[PDB]
Short mmCIF file of C-alpha atoms and ligand atoms in Angstrom, two decimals:
data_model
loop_
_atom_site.label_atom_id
_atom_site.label_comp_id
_atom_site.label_asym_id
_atom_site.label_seq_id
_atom_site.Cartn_x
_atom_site.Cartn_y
_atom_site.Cartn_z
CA UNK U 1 66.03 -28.51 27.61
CA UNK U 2 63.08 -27.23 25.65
CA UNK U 3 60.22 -25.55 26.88
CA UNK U 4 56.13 -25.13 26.19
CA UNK U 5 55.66 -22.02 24.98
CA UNK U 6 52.16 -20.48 24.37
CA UNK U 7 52.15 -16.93 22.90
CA UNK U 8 49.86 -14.73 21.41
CA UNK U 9 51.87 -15.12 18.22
CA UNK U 10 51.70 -18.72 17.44
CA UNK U 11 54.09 -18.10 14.80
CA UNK U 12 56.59 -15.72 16.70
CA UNK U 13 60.27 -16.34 15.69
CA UNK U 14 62.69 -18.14 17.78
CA UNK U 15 64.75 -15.48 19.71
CA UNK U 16 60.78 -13.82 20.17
CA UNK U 17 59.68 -17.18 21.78
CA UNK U 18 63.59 -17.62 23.50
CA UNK U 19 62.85 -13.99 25.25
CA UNK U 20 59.45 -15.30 26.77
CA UNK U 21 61.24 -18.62 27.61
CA UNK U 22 64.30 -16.79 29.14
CA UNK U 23 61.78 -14.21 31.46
CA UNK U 24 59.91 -17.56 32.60
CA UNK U 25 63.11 -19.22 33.97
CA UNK U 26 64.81 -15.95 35.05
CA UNK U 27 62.09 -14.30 37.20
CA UNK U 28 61.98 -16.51 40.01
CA UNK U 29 66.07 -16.39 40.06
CA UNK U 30 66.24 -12.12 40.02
CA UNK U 31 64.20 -9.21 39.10
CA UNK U 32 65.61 -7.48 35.80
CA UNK U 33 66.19 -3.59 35.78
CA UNK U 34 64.53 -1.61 33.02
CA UNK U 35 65.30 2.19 32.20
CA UNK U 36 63.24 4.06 29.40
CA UNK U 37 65.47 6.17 27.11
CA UNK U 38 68.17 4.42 28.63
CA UNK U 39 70.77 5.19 26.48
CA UNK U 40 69.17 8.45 24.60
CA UNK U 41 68.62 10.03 27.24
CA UNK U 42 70.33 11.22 30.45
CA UNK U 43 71.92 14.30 32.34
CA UNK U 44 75.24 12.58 32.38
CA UNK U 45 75.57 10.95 28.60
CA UNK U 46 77.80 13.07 26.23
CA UNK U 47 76.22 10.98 23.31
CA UNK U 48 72.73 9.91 22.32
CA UNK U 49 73.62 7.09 19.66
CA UNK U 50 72.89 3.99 22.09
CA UNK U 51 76.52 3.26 23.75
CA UNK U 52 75.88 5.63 27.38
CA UNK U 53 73.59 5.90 30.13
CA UNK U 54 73.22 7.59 33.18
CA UNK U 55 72.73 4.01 34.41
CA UNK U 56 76.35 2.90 33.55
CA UNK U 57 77.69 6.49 34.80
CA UNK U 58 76.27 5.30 38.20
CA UNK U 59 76.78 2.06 38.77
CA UNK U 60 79.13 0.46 35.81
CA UNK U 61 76.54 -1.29 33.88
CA UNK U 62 73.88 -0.61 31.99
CA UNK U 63 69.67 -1.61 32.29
CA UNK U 64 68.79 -5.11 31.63
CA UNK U 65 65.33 -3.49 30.33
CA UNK U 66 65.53 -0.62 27.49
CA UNK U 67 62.63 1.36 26.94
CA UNK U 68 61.22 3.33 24.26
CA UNK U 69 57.60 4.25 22.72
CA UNK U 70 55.66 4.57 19.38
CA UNK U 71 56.40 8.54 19.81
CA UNK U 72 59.92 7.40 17.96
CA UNK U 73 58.25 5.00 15.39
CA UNK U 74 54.88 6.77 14.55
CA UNK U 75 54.89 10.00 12.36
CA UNK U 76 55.81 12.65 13.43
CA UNK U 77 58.44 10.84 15.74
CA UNK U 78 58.47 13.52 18.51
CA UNK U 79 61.13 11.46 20.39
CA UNK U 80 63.38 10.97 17.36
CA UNK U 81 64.67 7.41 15.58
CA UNK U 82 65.34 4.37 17.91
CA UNK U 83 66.19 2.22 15.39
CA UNK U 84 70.43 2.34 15.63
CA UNK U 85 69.86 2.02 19.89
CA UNK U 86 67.80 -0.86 19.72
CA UNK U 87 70.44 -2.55 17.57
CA UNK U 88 73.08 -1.46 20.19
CA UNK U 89 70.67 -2.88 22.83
CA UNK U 90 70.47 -5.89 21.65
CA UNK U 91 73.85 -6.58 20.55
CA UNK U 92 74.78 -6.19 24.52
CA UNK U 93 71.96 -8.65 25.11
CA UNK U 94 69.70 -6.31 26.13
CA UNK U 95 65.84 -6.86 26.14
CA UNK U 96 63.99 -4.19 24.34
CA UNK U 97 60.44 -2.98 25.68
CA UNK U 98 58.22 -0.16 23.58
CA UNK U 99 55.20 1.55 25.14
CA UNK U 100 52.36 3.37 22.92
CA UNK U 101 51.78 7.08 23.37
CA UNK U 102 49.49 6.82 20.60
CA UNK U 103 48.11 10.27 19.21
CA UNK U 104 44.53 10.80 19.28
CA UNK U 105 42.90 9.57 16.27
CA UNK U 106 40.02 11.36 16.13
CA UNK U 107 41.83 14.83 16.50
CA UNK U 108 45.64 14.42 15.40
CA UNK U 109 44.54 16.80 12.32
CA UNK U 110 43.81 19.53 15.07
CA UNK U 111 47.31 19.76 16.79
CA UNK U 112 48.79 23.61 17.85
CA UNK U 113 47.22 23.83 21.47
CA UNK U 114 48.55 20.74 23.88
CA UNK U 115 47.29 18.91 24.20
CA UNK U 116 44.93 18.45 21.37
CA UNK U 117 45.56 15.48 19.18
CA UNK U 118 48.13 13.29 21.27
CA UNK U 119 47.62 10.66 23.98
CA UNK U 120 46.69 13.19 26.31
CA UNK U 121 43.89 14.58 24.92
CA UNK U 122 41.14 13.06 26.82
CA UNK U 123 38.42 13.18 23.68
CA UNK U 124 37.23 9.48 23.48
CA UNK U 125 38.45 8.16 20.40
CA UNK U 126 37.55 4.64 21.25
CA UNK U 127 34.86 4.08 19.37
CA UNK U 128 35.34 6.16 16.78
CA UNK U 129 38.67 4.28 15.53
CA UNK U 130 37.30 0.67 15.68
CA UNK U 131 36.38 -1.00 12.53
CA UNK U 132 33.16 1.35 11.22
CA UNK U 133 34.40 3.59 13.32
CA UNK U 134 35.25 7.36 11.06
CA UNK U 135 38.44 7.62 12.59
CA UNK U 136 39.55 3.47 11.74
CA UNK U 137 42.02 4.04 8.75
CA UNK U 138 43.96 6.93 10.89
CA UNK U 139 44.31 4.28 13.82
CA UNK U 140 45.59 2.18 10.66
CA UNK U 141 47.68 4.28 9.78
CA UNK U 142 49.51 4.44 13.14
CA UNK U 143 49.82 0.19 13.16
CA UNK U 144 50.98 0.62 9.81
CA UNK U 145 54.10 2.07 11.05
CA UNK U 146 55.01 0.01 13.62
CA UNK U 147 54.50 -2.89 11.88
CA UNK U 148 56.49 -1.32 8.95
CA UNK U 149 59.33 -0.41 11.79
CA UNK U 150 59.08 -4.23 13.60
CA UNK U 151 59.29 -5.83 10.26
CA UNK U 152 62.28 -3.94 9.49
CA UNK U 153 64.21 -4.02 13.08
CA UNK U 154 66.91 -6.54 12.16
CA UNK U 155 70.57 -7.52 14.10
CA UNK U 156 73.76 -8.01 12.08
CA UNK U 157 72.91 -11.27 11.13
CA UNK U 158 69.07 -10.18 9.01
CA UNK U 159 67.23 -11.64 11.93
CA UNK U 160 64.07 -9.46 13.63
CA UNK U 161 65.01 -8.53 17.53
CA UNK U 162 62.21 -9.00 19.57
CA UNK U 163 59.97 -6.46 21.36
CA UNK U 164 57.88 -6.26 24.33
CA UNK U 165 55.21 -3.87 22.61
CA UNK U 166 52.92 -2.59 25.65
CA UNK U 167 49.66 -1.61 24.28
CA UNK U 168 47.05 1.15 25.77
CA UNK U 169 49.00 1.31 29.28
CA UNK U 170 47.25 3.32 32.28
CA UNK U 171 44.03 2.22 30.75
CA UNK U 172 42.09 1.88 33.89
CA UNK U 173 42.52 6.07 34.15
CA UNK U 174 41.38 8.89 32.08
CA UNK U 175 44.29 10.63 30.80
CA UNK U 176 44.09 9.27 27.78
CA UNK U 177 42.20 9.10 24.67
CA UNK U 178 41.48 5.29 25.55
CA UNK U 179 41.10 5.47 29.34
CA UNK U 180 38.09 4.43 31.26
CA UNK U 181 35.98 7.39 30.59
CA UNK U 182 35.88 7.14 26.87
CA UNK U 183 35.46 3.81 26.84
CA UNK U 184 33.64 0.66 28.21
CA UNK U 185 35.77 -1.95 29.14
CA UNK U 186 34.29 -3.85 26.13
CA UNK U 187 34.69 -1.51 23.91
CA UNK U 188 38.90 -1.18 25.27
CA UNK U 189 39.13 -4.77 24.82
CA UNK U 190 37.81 -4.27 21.27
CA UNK U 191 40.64 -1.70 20.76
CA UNK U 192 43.23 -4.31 22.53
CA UNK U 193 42.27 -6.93 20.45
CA UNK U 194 41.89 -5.38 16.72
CA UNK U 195 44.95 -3.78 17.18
CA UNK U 196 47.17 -6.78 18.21
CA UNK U 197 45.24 -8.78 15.00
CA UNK U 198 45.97 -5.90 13.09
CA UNK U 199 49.91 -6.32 13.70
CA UNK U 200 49.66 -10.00 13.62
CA UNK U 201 48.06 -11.18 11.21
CA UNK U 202 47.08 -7.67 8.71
CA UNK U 203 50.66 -6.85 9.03
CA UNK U 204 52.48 -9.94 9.55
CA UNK U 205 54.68 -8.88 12.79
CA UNK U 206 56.43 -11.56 14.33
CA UNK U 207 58.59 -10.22 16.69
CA UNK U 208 56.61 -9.14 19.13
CA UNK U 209 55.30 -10.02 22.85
CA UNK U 210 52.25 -8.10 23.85
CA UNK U 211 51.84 -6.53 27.25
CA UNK U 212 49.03 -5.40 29.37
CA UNK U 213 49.54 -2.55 31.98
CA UNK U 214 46.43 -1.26 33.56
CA UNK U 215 47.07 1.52 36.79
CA UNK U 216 47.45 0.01 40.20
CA UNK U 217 44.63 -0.89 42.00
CA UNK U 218 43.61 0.44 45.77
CA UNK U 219 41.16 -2.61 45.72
CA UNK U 220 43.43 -5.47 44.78
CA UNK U 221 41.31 -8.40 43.36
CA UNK U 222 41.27 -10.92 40.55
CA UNK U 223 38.13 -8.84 39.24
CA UNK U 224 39.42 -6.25 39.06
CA UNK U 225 42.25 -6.65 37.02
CA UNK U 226 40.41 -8.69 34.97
CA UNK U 227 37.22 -5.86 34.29
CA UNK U 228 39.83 -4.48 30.96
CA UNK U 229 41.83 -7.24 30.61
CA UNK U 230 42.05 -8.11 26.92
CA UNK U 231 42.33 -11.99 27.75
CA UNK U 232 44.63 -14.36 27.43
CA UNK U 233 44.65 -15.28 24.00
CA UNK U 234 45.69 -11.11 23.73
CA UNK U 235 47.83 -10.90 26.19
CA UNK U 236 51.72 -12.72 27.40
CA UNK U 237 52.37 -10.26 29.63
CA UNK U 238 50.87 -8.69 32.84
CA UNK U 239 52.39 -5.98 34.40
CA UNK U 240 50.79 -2.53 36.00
CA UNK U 241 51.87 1.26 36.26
CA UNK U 242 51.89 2.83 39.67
CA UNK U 243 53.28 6.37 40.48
CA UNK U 244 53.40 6.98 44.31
CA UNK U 245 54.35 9.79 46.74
CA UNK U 246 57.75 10.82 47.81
CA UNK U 247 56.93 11.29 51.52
CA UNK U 248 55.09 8.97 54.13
CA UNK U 249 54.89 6.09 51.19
CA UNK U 250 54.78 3.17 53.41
CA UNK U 251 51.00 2.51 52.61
CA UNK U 252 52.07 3.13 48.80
CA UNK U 253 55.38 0.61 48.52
CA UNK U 254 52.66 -1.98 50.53
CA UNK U 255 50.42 -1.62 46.99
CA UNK U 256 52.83 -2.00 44.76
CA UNK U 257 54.00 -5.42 46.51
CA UNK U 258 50.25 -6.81 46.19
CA UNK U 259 49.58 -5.73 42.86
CA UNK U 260 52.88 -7.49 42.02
CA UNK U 261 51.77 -10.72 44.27
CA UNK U 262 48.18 -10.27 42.26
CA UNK U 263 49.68 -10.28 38.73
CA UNK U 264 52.41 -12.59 39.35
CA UNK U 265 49.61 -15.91 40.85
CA UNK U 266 48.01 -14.80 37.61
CA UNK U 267 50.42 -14.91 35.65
CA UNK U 268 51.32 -18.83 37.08
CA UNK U 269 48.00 -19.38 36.33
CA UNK U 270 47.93 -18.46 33.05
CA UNK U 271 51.46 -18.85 31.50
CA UNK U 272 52.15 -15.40 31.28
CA UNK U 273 55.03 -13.28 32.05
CA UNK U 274 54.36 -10.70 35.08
CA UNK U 275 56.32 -7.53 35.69
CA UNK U 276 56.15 -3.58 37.02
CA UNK U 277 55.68 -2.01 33.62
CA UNK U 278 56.28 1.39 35.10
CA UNK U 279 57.05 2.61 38.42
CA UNK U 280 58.40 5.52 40.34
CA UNK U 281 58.18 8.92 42.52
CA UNK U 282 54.87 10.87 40.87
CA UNK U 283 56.50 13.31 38.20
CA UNK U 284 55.19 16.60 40.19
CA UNK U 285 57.07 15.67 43.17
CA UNK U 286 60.44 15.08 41.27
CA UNK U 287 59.85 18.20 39.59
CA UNK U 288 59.28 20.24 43.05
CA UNK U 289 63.16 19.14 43.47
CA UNK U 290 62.06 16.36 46.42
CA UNK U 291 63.71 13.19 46.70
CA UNK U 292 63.49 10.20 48.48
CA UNK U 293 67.26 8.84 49.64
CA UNK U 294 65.50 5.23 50.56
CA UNK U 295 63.56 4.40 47.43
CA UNK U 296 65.25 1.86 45.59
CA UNK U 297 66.10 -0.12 48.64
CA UNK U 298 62.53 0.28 50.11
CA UNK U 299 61.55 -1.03 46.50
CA UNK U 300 64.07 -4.26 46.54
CA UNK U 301 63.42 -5.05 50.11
CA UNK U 302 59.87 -5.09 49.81
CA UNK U 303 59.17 -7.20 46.08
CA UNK U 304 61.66 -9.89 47.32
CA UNK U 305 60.42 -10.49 50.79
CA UNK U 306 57.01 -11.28 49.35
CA UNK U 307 56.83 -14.80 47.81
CA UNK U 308 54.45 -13.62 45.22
CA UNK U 309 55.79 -10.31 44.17
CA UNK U 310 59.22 -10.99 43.76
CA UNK U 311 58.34 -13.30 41.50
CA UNK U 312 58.17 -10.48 38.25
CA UNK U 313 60.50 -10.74 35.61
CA UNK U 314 61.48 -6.90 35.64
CA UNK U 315 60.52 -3.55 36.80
CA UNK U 316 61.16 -0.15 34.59
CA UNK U 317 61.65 2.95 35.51
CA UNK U 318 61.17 6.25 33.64
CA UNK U 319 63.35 8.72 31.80
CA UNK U 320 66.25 10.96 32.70
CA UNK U 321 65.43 14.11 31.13
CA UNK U 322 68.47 15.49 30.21
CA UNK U 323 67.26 19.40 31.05
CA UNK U 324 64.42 18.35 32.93
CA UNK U 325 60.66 19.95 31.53
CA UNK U 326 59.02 23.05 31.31
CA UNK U 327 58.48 24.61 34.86
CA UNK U 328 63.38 23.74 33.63
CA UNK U 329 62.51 21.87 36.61
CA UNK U 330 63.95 18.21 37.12
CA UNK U 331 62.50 15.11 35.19
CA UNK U 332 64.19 12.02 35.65
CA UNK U 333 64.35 8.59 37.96
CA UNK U 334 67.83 6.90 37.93
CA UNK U 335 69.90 8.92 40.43
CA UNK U 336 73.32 10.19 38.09
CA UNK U 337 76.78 10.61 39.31
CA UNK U 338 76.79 14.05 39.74
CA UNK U 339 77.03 16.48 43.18
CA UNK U 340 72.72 16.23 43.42
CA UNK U 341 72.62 13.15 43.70
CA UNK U 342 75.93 12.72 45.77
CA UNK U 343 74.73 14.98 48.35
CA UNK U 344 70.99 14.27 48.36
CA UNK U 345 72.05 10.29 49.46
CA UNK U 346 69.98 9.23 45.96
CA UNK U 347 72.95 7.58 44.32
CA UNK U 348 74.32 5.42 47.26
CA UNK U 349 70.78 4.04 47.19
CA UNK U 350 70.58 3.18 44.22
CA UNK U 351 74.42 1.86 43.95
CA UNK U 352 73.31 -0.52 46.71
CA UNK U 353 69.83 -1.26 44.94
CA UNK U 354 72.28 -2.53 42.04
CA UNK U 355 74.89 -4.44 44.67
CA UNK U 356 71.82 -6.34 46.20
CA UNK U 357 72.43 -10.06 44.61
CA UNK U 358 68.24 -10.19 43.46
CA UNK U 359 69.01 -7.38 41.04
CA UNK U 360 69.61 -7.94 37.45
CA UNK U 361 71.10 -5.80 34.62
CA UNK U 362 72.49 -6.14 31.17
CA UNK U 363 75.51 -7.95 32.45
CA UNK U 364 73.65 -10.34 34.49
CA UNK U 365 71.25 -12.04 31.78
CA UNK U 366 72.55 -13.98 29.50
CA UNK U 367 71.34 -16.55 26.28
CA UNK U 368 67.97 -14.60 26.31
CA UNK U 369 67.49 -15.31 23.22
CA UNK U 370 69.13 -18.88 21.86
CA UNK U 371 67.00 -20.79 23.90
CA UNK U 372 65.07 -24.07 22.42
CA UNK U 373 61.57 -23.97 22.42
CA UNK U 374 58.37 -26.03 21.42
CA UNK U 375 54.64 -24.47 21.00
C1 LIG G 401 54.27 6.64 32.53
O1 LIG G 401 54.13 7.77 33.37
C2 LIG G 401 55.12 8.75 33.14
C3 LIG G 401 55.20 9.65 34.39
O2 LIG G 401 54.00 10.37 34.58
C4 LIG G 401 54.77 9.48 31.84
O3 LIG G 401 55.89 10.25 31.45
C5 LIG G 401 55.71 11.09 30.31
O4 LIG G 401 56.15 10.43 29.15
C6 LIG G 401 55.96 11.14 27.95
C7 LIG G 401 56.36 10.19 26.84
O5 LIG G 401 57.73 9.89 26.95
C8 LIG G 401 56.71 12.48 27.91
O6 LIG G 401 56.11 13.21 26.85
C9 LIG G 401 56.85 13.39 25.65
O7 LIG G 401 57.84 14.34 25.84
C10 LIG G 401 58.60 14.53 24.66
C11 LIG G 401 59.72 15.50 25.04
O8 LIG G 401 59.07 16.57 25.69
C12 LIG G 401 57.74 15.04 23.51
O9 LIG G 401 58.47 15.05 22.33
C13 LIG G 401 56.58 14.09 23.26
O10 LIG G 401 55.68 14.55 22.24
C14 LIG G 401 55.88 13.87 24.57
O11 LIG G 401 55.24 15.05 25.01
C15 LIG G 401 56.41 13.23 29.21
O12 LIG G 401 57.19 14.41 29.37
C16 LIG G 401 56.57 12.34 30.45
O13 LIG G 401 57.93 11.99 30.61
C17 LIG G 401 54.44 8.45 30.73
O14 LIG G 401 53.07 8.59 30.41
C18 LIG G 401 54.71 6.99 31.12
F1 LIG G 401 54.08 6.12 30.21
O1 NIN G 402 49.26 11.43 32.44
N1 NIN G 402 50.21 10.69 32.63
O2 NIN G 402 50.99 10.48 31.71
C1 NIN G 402 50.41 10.11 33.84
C2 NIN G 402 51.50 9.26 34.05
C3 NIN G 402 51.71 8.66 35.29
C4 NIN G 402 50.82 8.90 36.34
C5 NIN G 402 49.73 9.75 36.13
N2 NIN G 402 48.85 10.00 37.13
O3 NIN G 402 49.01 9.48 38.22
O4 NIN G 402 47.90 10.74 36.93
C6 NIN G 402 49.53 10.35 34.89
NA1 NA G 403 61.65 -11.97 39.91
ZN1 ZN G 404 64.90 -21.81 38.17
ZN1 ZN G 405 52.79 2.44 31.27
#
């Protein structure tokens, strides 16, 4: 049966418009696991070309959700080529997400001391790459690319695979270049806006979805979400990012069930798509070698027992560093088979995270994108 579909991209191919179509029907039925690096990364994968993941080694099936980011499309591609992975995603049915860890415009040229010239250099850079804006044709020049790479991102059959770009995430902090300090929320709408025209109709991209993904919010309101947010002819997806503690994180797990229950009666309300963009344990307490054994069922129990929240199409979660990060100290999310984890209790809950019947990954989804549709 066909369905209304109104996206950002009123001229968005048909497996682009089948994905939003498939993530409307399938959210109220299950929430969809995503994994970024999913299969390029991982402690337990003895190959990085897009057939393992530390998800399959632990549970026999891989992410619905694979993520990646401009930092393997954008010059100079600091997270290597994605191209051959996405295909591999997507020939398993996969849905493919990519995040934007933009470098800094305004000081890219100045890179040797990080973090000076990538995301997380905190110099605003807001106004400065706008239109008039000095720093405008190096923003350019970043857009250039990944329309250049979304053009190009074809299946075996020469048609585009669509992508859940996420644009300016954690905007609502100031860790990066376009975060609430260096801009007003005007002026980060601006930025939103120009640089989803820019793709769209500049570039001629087709194959995207755009997402939203401000920070959680302690003060969970309509408002509030909606003081940055780009609007809706900018936006067809609403999710959030929300890092919490791994100790006494009742209070914490209760936030992240309203800001899901806020963005998904928004989202009904405004024929978007909502979801958890990002979500886990805070990095510094992973990398302090803590671990919390009741996580992912905390996580389950909690979205689906709300009427609202469990409503989201998917959640993500971040990567498995495959020898961790600089102190090597551990950097990673999806528990692996191996002793750690075995020991530690972290795998059995996340084995029965995947066993609960509202969980859904690659095998699970199915037709996502050879559904009929009508704008
Ligand atoms: C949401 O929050 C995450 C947890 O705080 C953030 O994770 C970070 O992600 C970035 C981007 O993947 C990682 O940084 C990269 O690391 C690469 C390998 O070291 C390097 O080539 C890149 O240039 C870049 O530094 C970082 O270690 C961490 O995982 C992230 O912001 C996410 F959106
Ligand atoms: O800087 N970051 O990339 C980042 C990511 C996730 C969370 C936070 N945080 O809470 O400050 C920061
Ligand atoms: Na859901
Ligand atoms: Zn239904
Ligand atoms: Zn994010």
């Amino acid at each position: 049966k066909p369905v209304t579909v109104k996206l950002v991209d009123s001229q968005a191919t048909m497996e682009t418009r089948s994905l939003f179509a498939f993530m409307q029907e399938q959210r109220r039925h299950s929430i969809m696991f995503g994994h970024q690096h999913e299969t390029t990364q991982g402690l337990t994968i003895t190959r990085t070309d897009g057939t393992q993941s530390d998800t399959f080694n632990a549970v026999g099936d891989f992410a619905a959700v694979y993520g990646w980011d401009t930092l393997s499309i954008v010059a100079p591609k600091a997270e290597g080529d994605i191209v051959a992975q996405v295909k591999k995603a997507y020939a398993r049915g996969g849905i493919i997400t990519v995040s934007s860890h933009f470098d800094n415009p305004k000081t890219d040229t100045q890179k040797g001391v990080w973090p000076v010239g990538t995301s997380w250099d905190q110099t605003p850079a807001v106004v400065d790459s706008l239109p008039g804006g000095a720093y405008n044709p190096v923003l350019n020049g970043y857009l250039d690319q990944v329309a250049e790479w979304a053009n190009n991102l074809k299946d075996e059959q020469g048609r585009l695979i669509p992508v859940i770009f996420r644009l300016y995430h954690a905007n609502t902090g100031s860790w990066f270049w376009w975060g609430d300090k260096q801009s007003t929320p005007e002026q980060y709408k601006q930025l939103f806006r120009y640089s989803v025209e820019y793709l769209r109709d500049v570039k001629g991209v087709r194959n995207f979805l755009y997402a939203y993904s401000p920070n959680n919010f302690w003060d969970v309101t309509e408002a509030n979400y909606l003081e940055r947010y780009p609007g809706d002819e900018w936006v067809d997806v609403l999710g959030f990012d929300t890092y919490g503690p791994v100790a006494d994180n009742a209070d914490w797990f209760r936030n992240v069930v309203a800001n899901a229950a806020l963005v998904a009666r928004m989202a009904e309300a405004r024929g978007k798509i909502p979801v958890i963009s990002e979500i886990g344990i805070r990095a510094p307490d992973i990398e302090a070698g803590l671990y919390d054994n009741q996580w992912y069922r905390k996580l389950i129990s909690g979205l689906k027992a709300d009427p609202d929240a469990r409503e989201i199409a998917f959640l993500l979660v971040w990567r498995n560093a495959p020898q961790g990060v600089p102190g090597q100290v551990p950097h990673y999310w999806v528990p692996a088979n191996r002793p750690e984890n075995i020991n530690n209790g972290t795998l059995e809950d996340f084995q029965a995270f995947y066993a609960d019947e509202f969980t859904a990954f690659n095998r699970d989804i199915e037709q996502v994108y050879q559904r009929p549709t009508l704008i």
